Amino acid sequence: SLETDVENIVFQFQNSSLDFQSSDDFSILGIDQPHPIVRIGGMFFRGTWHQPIGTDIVVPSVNDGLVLCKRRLMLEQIRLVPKNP
Amino acid sequence: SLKISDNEYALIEHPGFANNKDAFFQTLGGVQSIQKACQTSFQNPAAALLELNLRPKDKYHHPVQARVQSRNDLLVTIKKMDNSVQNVSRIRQVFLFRDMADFQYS
Ligand SMILES: [Hg+2]
Ligand SMILES: [Hg+2]
B69, amino acid identity: Q
Q: Return the closest-CA partner of residue A63 out of B61, B94, B48, B75.
A: B75
Burial of A24 per CB tally in 10 Å (0-12, 13-18, 19+): middle
Q: Rounded CA gap, B95 and B74, in Å? A: 15
Cβ–Cβ < 8 Å for B3, A25: yes
B102, amino acid identity: D
Question: Contacts of residue B89 in chain A, CB cutoff 8 Å?
Answer: 63
B104, amino acid identity: Q
Interface membership of B2 toward A (CB under 8 Å): yes
The neighbour count for residue B76, using CB atoms within 10 Å, is 22
Cβ–Cβ < 8 Å for A37, B14: no
Bridge partners of A57, per DSSP, are: A67, B12
> Using H for helix, E for strand and C for coil, what is the string for A14-73?
CCCCCCCCCCCEEEEECCCCCCCEEEECCEEEEEEEECCCCEEEEEECCCCCEEECCCEE
Domain A1-85 has CATH 2.60.40.4370: yes
B99, amino acid identity: D
Enumerate domains of chain B plus CATH numbers.
1-106 (3.30.200.160)
Residue B24: phi and psi, rounded to 5, are -60, -50
Residues in chain A: 85
The neighbour count for residue B40, using CB atoms within 10 Å, is 18
State how beta strands B8-14 and B84-96 pair.
Answer: parallel
Resolution given for this structure, in angstroms = 2.4
Write down the domain spans for chain A.
1-85
What element of type H or E holds B43? helix B31-43
Residues flanking ion ligand 1, Cβ below 5 Å: A 69
Experimental approach:
X-ray
Choose the closest CB to B79 out of A6, A55, A63: A6
- Whether A60 sits inside 8 A of B7 (CB atoms) is yes
